[PDB]
Design an enzyme around this catalytic site. Structure first.
Site, PDB file in Angstrom:
ATOM      1  N   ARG A 125       0.861  -1.176   0.000  1.00 51.46           N
ATOM      2  CA  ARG A 125       0.000   0.000   0.000  1.00 51.46           C
ATOM      3  C   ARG A 125       0.903   1.233   0.000  1.00 51.46           C
ATOM      4  NH1 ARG A 125      -2.833   2.770   4.857  1.00 51.46           N
ATOM      5  NH2 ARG A 125      -3.884   4.428   3.667  1.00 51.46           N
ATOM      6  N   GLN A 179      -7.743   7.298   6.806  1.00 49.10           N
ATOM      7  CA  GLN A 179      -8.301   7.489   8.132  1.00 49.10           C
ATOM      8  C   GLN A 179      -9.248   8.674   8.197  1.00 49.10           C
ATOM      9  OE1 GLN A 179      -4.506   5.517  10.585  1.00 49.10           O
ATOM     10  NE2 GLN A 179      -5.130   7.602  11.116  1.00 49.10           N
ATOM     11  N   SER A 209      -9.304  11.276  11.112  1.00 45.57           N
ATOM     12  CA  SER A 209      -8.138  12.043  11.493  1.00 45.57           C
ATOM     13  C   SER A 209      -8.074  13.469  11.077  1.00 45.57           C
ATOM     14  CB  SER A 209      -6.873  11.336  11.003  1.00 45.57           C
ATOM     15  OG  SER A 209      -6.750  10.018  11.541  1.00 45.57           O
ATOM     16  N   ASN A 257      -7.401   0.387   9.286  1.00 47.65           N
ATOM     17  CA  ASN A 257      -6.153   0.523  10.046  1.00 47.65           C
ATOM     18  C   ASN A 257      -6.491   0.214  11.541  1.00 47.65           C
ATOM     19  OD1 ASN A 257      -5.234   1.589   7.633  1.00 47.65           O
ATOM     20  ND2 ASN A 257      -4.788   3.634   8.474  1.00 47.65           N
ATOM     21  N   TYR A 299      -4.445   0.132  15.460  1.00 46.30           N
ATOM     22  CA  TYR A 299      -3.267   0.215  16.296  1.00 46.30           C
ATOM     23  C   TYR A 299      -3.546  -0.135  17.782  1.00 46.30           C
ATOM     24  CZ  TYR A 299      -0.874   2.369  12.368  1.00 46.30           C
ATOM     25  OH  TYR A 299      -0.178   2.638  11.191  1.00 46.30           O
ATOM     26  N   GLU A 326      -3.188  -0.872   7.730  1.00 49.31           N
ATOM     27  CA  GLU A 326      -2.077  -0.486   8.570  1.00 49.31           C
ATOM     28  C   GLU A 326      -2.175  -1.211   9.920  1.00 49.31           C
ATOM     29  OE1 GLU A 326      -1.447   3.778   9.266  1.00 49.31           O
ATOM     30  OE2 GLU A 326      -2.043   4.219   7.167  1.00 49.31           O
TER      31      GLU A 326
HETATM   32  O1  LIG Z   1      -5.635   4.898  16.896  1.00 49.25           O
HETATM   33  C1  LIG Z   1      -5.120   5.431  16.175  1.00 49.25           C
HETATM   34  O2  LIG Z   1      -3.802   5.018  15.757  1.00 49.25           O
HETATM   35  C2  LIG Z   1      -3.098   5.909  14.991  1.00 49.25           C
HETATM   36  C3  LIG Z   1      -1.668   6.258  15.515  1.00 49.25           C
HETATM   37  O3  LIG Z   1      -1.802   7.015  16.682  1.00 49.25           O
HETATM   38  C4  LIG Z   1      -0.730   5.072  15.692  1.00 49.25           C
HETATM   39  O4  LIG Z   1       0.589   5.497  15.965  1.00 49.25           O
HETATM   40  C5  LIG Z   1      -4.069   7.092  14.649  1.00 49.25           C
HETATM   41  O5  LIG Z   1      -3.572   7.945  13.593  1.00 49.25           O
HETATM   42  C6  LIG Z   1      -5.259   6.881  15.392  1.00 49.25           C
HETATM   43  O6  LIG Z   1      -6.109   7.778  15.491  1.00 49.25           O
END
Ligand SMILES: O=C1O[C@H]([C@@H](O)CO)C(O)=C1O
Ligand SMILES: *[C@@H]1O[C@H](CO)[C@@H](O[C@@H]2O[C@H](CO)[C@@H](O[C@@H]3O[C@H](CO[C@H]4O[C@@H](CO)[C@@H](O)[C@H](O)[C@@H]4O)[C@@H](O)[C@H](O[C@H]4O[C@H](CO)[C@@H](O)[C@H](O)[C@@H]4O)[C@@H]3O[C@@H]3OC[C@@H](O)[C@H](O)[C@H]3O)[C@H](O)[C@H]2NC(C)=O)[C@H](O[C@@H]2O[C@@H](C)[C@@H](O)[C@@H](O)[C@@H]2O)[C@H]1NC(C)=O
Ligand SMILES: *[C@@H]1O[C@H](CO)[C@@H](O[C@@H]2O[C@H](CO)[C@@H](O[C@@H]3O[C@H](CO[C@H]4O[C@@H](CO)[C@@H](O)[C@H](O)[C@@H]4O)[C@@H](O)[C@H](O[C@H]4O[C@H](CO)[C@@H](O)[C@H](O)[C@@H]4O)[C@@H]3O[C@@H]3OC[C@@H](O)[C@H](O)[C@H]3O)[C@H](O)[C@H]2NC(C)=O)[C@H](O[C@@H]2O[C@@H](C)[C@@H](O)[C@@H](O)[C@@H]2O)[C@H]1NC(C)=O
Ligand SMILES: *[C@@H]1O[C@H](CO)[C@@H](O[C@@H]2O[C@H](CO)[C@@H](O[C@@H]3O[C@H](CO)[C@@H](O)[C@H](O)[C@@H]3O[C@@H]3OC[C@@H](O)[C@H](O)[C@H]3O)[C@H](O)[C@H]2NC(C)=O)[C@H](O[C@@H]2O[C@@H](C)[C@@H](O)[C@@H](O)[C@@H]2O)[C@H]1NC(C)=O
Ligand SMILES: *[C@@H]1O[C@H](CO)[C@@H](O[C@@H]2O[C@H](CO)[C@@H](O[C@@H]3O[C@H](CO)[C@@H](O)[C@H](O)[C@@H]3O[C@@H]3OC[C@@H](O)[C@H](O)[C@H]3O)[C@H](O)[C@H]2NC(C)=O)[C@H](O[C@@H]2O[C@@H](C)[C@@H](O)[C@@H](O)[C@@H]2O)[C@H]1NC(C)=O
Ligand SMILES: *[C@@H]1O[C@H](CO)[C@@H](O[C@@H]2O[C@H](CO)[C@@H](O)[C@H](O)[C@H]2NC(C)=O)[C@H](O)[C@H]1NC(C)=O
Ligand SMILES: *[C@@H]1O[C@H](CO)[C@@H](O[C@@H]2O[C@H](CO)[C@@H](O)[C@H](O)[C@H]2NC(C)=O)[C@H](O)[C@H]1NC(C)=O
Ligand SMILES: *[C@@H]1O[C@H](CO)[C@@H](O)[C@H](O)[C@H]1NC(C)=O
Ligand SMILES: *[C@@H]1O[C@H](CO)[C@@H](O)[C@H](O)[C@H]1NC(C)=O
Ligand SMILES: *[C@@H]1O[C@H](CO)[C@@H](O)[C@H](O)[C@H]1NC(C)=O
Ligand SMILES: *[C@@H]1O[C@H](CO)[C@@H](O)[C@H](O)[C@H]1NC(C)=O
Ligand SMILES: *[C@@H]1O[C@H](CO)[C@@H](O)[C@H](O)[C@H]1NC(C)=O
Ligand SMILES: *[C@@H]1O[C@H](CO)[C@@H](O)[C@H](O)[C@H]1NC(C)=O
Ligand SMILES: *[C@@H]1O[C@H](CO)[C@@H](O)[C@H](O)[C@H]1NC(C)=O
Ligand SMILES: *[C@@H]1O[C@H](CO)[C@@H](O)[C@H](O)[C@H]1NC(C)=O
Ligand SMILES: *[C@@H]1O[C@H](CO)[C@@H](O)[C@H](O)[C@H]1NC(C)=O
Ligand SMILES: *[C@@H]1O[C@H](CO)[C@@H](O)[C@H](O)[C@H]1NC(C)=O
Ligand SMILES: *[C@@H]1O[C@H](CO)[C@@H](O)[C@H](O)[C@H]1NC(C)=O
Ligand SMILES: *[C@@H]1O[C@H](CO)[C@@H](O)[C@H](O)[C@H]1NC(C)=O
Ligand SMILES: O=C1O[C@H]([C@@H](O)CO)C(O)=C1O
Ligand SMILES: [Zn+2]
Lengths: 499, 499
Positions: B93, B185, B188, B326, B328, B407
């Protein structure tokens, strides 16, 4: 009778023989800077010098250096004032970054109040120390948005955006600033920005430089020059009609050179020399003094040269209270073909001249000005008498204008270590030899010159060269930019100003 | 029966117990990147991540680092392919920089043919090595011109400019690219770009952050989110109506988190947790699956929440072939006030929840994810089971979508020396523990997940953190960026893919 030297060694560094008292008591002495070169990007929007240096890094300088942080005069403006105060300078030329006060280019999109405050504090600080500001509204750093919306000075939309920007500057700062410069070195952006693509925005014909994103080197320098003159003139009209109460003066900045024949007994070289005066100086001074381009340009450039309407001609003609004349060097001129049909034709070929620093009998015009390490046959040499010749020519040809020398200086290599860089005797020599000829021309020819601002206050990002050369009268360490330490030249200049 | 670990120590780094063969034979494994983070500015126009990092350097990262040169994947794209080829990756990607192919933002102003060629060469090179491209059209790097003309995604003009950009990408690359991502995202930019001003463009209410140039943190995140959904949907419609012949698929990228109650026997914490799912995931997935925002958002946000017309609702609803998710980390949620009248109100307060990594009885959710050196009570912790919870929730709540994990990764500190940085066992642990839970959720819940792309291929500029952290599976020396050397994690991942 005043005698000035033209060749090394010079002896004008002795302030017993040459000092500010040599000049009229009201004469202004100082130094100059520009915004892109000294402030840094913090607190401002992006402009075409950010865009160009980042898109074409090998054009920004051999080191790929740019104005991102530079000497950080955004943070250390007070240190610049301190240098000026140490010099006992009475003038300082700086520029306003359009992108710092209207980051979105067009005034109706909003202003950056903190940007306005930055310049208010600098101006207040300079006046508190007795320094007269000379403020350039446009030192090449056009907001990137405008270049992306309509290609900047390539389009007539620039006129009203520049006018609204200048109006904001007059409104906010004109109660304290009484000397305004409109556009820095009129010749430069058309030729280097739109002809050779050495400068932002970097447009040219495809075969001139395949890296250019777009352009036409044969036509666009003339369009952009024409729009610069109209934008300049609209701002001067606005100033003189709407801000007369502020009691200030406004003018353009010219880059000046003198020209001599490569062979002074050859009529073809003599003719090329006269064509260079018209194509280099007259391109702008014709319109500024007469509302028309020079006849040789009309004849040569033909349909590629825009016309002024009667209204436009009237607007442009006489659109200055003074001229800011930058002067660095002189060139020899010899004939050269003008291949207008070649795909690599450029506007600069229209003058029909090739320019050198060595004449037909092998004489180099003067001392070294700039070494070109890739090619030493391309070294630049200076010519102190050229400042005398230029000022005399402006008085005689261009109706005895009021002049301020708004730049004059010389670089030293960035490879030198700090100790060598501080021992800048070649800069003393350059500045004193020009000041001697300036005093001589004022006395002998009665040219109305009323100030002199040396390039530059301090080391900075040099357009096209990154940090590979230094121009400052004060030294800046690129590993810790806070201090500006007077070099030998700055120390000499301090004694010249207060002997 | 599959058993996965949630706490250190992990044992999933042994490819005898967990490898690609654990997953379906067609499952895609690879890594991810984005354009601003890896290419450099050479050869492109300027975008709002250049603008933000240069105007607000202390927001770019503690080191003031930015994407000017980064790992120079403009020059070294082949080295990126070589990393992928070493891994035996089947997917990669990457994003297209809008400013590289239409530097002037609006397509009618012209395209950058050399920019187009860059992506053509990368795509051709990836396909030649058997790697499936997953291409993000917009990974936050909006041309600066568009933000300056109309404030980018704050204005509905963005819709047609984004549509014309995406059309050019489909036309030029869609014969080879069969997986497209629209906007990275969704959550964001509205929140961080227009709420907290931690990200470009850096707008917010005056009392939230006095450095913001303009904004309103209470209203603008909702406007920008709404325009993102409409722009996304217009591009999906264009793709599915005009480029069906290319036989590809398109979707948005969501940032996902799971949420757990800070106190799982407290109804108020339980309610905050459910509100966080709606305000964090449903804000976008409601419109994408139903054409409407969640009812709790309608009720809370009131007049600040835009409405979709019937036509708009229809456009947005169902506007994906798959979802790029994504993932995390996970947070605990507890109630918090929503002071809508406060001058420092932000859209993020509307969920009425405070988020932590430690629950009411003092339990930290999982192993360290990101250390915050200024404040250790702000450290982030991860939660491997959260990937299972998220995928299960998407299948159950959001109509059994096709998913690609676009991600998943973890950083290590930039203060570590090279040897420590290469010995990145904490990254093996993070990636394997998530992959175990991913395999478990696919088996147990039959979630339609068909690939996994780890963040990141190599060390790069990290948004907000400069070069102060590293995310790569391959190591880059910032003093000489040519090489990308597989770390222990990259070496492990190579064995996981080909065991
Ligand atoms: O939860 C999330 O993860 C990522 C990043 O913080 C990981 O490092 C992000 O852009 C979010 O809003
Ligand atoms: C200072 O500004 C003044 C103007 O305010 C400059 O003087 C003007 O100079 C121009 C030449 O550049 C003269 O224009 C020529 O006029 C001929 C005479 O026309 C009049 O009678 C007709 C002539 O037979 C007729 O058709 C016309 O309609 C008028 O009735 C023209 O034919 C010339 O046009 C040919 O040449 C042009 C190139 O020069 C070319 O572009 C045209 O296509 C054409 O082939 C020219 O006419 C000009 O044509 C272009 C059009 O856009 C203009 O409006 C049109 O005028 C002016 O007559 C003259 N005006 C006056 C008031 O004197 C002055 O020029 C300097 O001085 C003049 C004497 C001359 O020596 C110039 O060579 C010298 O530069 C400027 N001074 C400086 C120092 O630049
Ligand atoms: C999936 O999408 C479907 C829509 O395609 C969602 O269902 C819609 O849900 C809304 C509530 O969000 C319902 O709208 C309410 O309709 C009342 C009934 O009106 C009809 O009869 C009248 C009622 O007495 C009359 O005036 C009206 O003209 C109709 O004849 C309304 O009063 C509601 O308005 C009040 O509440 C609004 C906030 O919800 C507020 O914004 C308004 O000012 C008002 O105070 C609401 O009417 C909506 O008002 C706003 C206007 O912009 C809208 O066009 C207008 O509809 C819909 O009737 C319902 N549509 C249908 C076809 O069922 C569905 O919502 C989920 O399911 C429904 C059953 C409900 O439980 C929701 O709470 C739940 O979210 C969406 N599903 C998901 C999972 O989100
Ligand atoms: C400064 O410019 C002057 C004027 O142009 C140069 O002087 C001229 O130099 C020409 C040689 O380049 C001379 O012409 C030559 O004359 C010899 C003797 O008759 C002859 O054999 C040549 O073939 C040539 O003649 C020309 O051929 C081309 C024809 O189209 C043209 O009609 C012929 O004239 C020319 O006489 C001379 N003019 C004058 C007024 O002296 C000058 O060149 C320098 O001085 C001359 C005297 C000579 O020594 C050159 O070698 C020497 O370069 C040039 N100065 C410099 C330093 O370049
Ligand atoms: C997880 O959430 C639960 C549910 O909210 C917490 O349990 C509750 O904790 C309250 C104390 O924060 C308990 O109320 C107190 O009861 C004592 C004994 O009667 C009384 O003296 C108090 O003043 C207080 O009473 C409340 O006062 C405020 C009134 O508005 C309200 O009506 C009263 O209830 C409450 O009984 C208890 N609920 C339950 C179902 O057990 C829980 O807190 C943890 O467990 C409780 C038993 C107690 O040991 C707390 O110290 C301990 O924190 C919370 N868990 C955690 C780990 O925070
Ligand atoms: C520069 O623009 C000029 C003017 O548009 C182009 O010159 C013309 O070339 C067109 C095509 O040959 C000719 O028909 C005209 O007679 C020329 N006009 C003039 C005013 O010279 C020129 O080709 C463009 N150069 C580049 C490199 O694109
Ligand atoms: C955010 O924008 C909102 C909406 O324009 C502003 O909120 C309004 O505040 C105006 C002035 O008080 C009030 O009359 C309205 O009732 C409020 N409208 C709503 C929808 O809440 C808010 O003040 C702006 N915030 C900032 C910091 O400028
Ligand atoms: C200044 O230079 C003039 C000559 O121009 C000289 O006569 C005068 O003494 C010098 N002043 C000082 C203080 O050295
Ligand atoms: C410098 O950069 C341009 C791309 O902007 C490239 O075309 C040219 O080859 C490079 N110059 C040299 C001499 O390497
Ligand atoms: C002068 O300012 C007035 C008031 O804003 C404006 O109407 C007029 O157009 C301006 N003038 C110029 C450039 O003369
Ligand atoms: C194109 O120009 C370069 C510089 O102008 C020159 O050296 C070369 O001869 C030119 N070629 C043609 C075809 O005119
Ligand atoms: C940088 O220069 C300033 C001025 O000399 C000095 O005070 C400061 O300590 C220097 N910083 C470092 C890190 O050396
Ligand atoms: C400043 O210059 C003025 C004017 O020539 C002079 O009177 C004053 O002594 C000088 N100050 C210093 C410190 O040199
Ligand atoms: C792959 O992992 C599976 C368990 O998921 C294991 O049974 C298989 O042997 C492993 N493959 C290799 C080559 O180790
Ligand atoms: C960081 O930069 C902003 C200006 O962009 C300034 O307002 C703020 O004080 C600086 N932050 C810190 C903590 O120094
Ligand atoms: C489809 O492409 C055609 C031809 O350019 C265009 O007329 C039509 O509006 C496009 N459609 C979308 C988004 O459906
Ligand atoms: C403003 O917000 C900060 C963070 O949101 C908070 O700590 C502070 O209490 C708030 N102040 C007011 C006046 O609400
Ligand atoms: C930089 O790294 C590349 C790849 O290892 C190497 O080949 C090159 O010599 C290195 N450059 C320097 C200046 O060390
Ligand atoms: C590449 O992966 C394929 C498919 O699993 C496998 O057959 C091949 O051996 C692997 N190649 C290497 C060099 O690991
Ligand atoms: O003659 C000129 O001088 C300067 C510069 O080259 C001095 O370094 C410039 O911009 C001209 O066009
Ligand atoms: Zn930069």
């Amino acid at each position: 009778e005043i005698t000035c030297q033209e060749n090394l060694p010079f002896t004008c560094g002795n302030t017993d023989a040459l000092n500010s008292s040599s000049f009229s008591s009201d004469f202004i002495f100082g130094v100059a800077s520009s915004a892109y070169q000294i402030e840094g990007t913090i607190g401002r929007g992006l402009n075409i010098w950010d865009g160009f240096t980042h898109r074409y890094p090998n054009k920004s300088g051999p080191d790929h250096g740019n104005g991102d942080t530079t000497c950080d005069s955004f943070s250390y403006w007070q240190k610049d004032i301190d240098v000026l105060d140490e010099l006992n300078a009475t003038g300082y030329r700086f520029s306003i970054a359009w992108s710092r006060i209207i980051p979105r280019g067009k005034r109706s999109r909003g202003v950056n109040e903190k940007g306005i405050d930055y310049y208010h504090g600098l101006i207040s600080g300079l006046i508190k120390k007795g320094i007269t500001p000379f403020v350039t509204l446009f030192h090449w750093d056009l907001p990137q948005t405008l270049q992306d919306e309509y290609e900047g000075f390539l389009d007539p939309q620039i006129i009203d955006d520049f006018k609204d920007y200048a109006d904001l500057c007059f409104e906010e700062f004109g109660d304290s600033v009484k000397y305004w410069l409109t556009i820095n070195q009129l010749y430069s952006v058309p030729t280097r920005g739109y002809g050779s693509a050495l400068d932002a925005p970097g447009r040219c014909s495809p075969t001139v430089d395949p890296s250019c994103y777009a352009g036409n080197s044969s036509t666009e320098p003339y369009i952009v020059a024409h729009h610069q003159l109209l934008a300049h003139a609209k701002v001067v009209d606005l100033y003189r009609k709407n801000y007369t109460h502020q009691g200030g003066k406004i003018g353009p900045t010219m880059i000046t050179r003198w020209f001599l024949p490569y062979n002074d007994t050859d009529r073809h070289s003599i003719a090329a020399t006269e064509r260079m005066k018209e194509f280099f100086l007259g391109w702008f001074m014709g319109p500024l003094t007469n509302g028309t381009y020079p006849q040789i340009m009309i004849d040569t450039v033909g349909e590629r040269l825009p016309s002024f309407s009667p209204e436009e001609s009237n607007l442009v003609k006489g659109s200055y209270d003074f001229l800011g004349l930058n002067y660095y060097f002189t060139q020899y001129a010899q004939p050269s073909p003008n291949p207008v049909n070649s795909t690599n034709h450029t506007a600069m070929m229209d003058a029909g001249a090739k320019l050198t620093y060595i004449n037909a009998s092998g004489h180099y015009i003067g001392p070294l000005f700039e070494k070109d390490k890739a090619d030493s046959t391309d070294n630049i040499y200076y010519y102190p008498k050229g400042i005398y010749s230029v000022m005399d020519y402006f008085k005689n040809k261009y109706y005895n204008p009021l002049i301020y020398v708004t730049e004059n200086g010389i670089s030293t290599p960035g490879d030198e270590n700090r100790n060598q860089s501080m021992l800048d005797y070649t800069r003393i020599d350059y500045l004193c030899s020009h000041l001697c000829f300036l005093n001589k021309v004022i006395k002998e020819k009665d040219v109305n010159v009323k100030g002199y601002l040396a390039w530059a206050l301090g080391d900075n990002y040099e357009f096209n060269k990154g940090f590979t050369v230094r121009f400052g009268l004060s030294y800046i360490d690129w590993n810790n930019v806070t201090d500006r330490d007077l070099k030998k030249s700055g120390q000499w200049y301090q004694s010249f100003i207060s002997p």
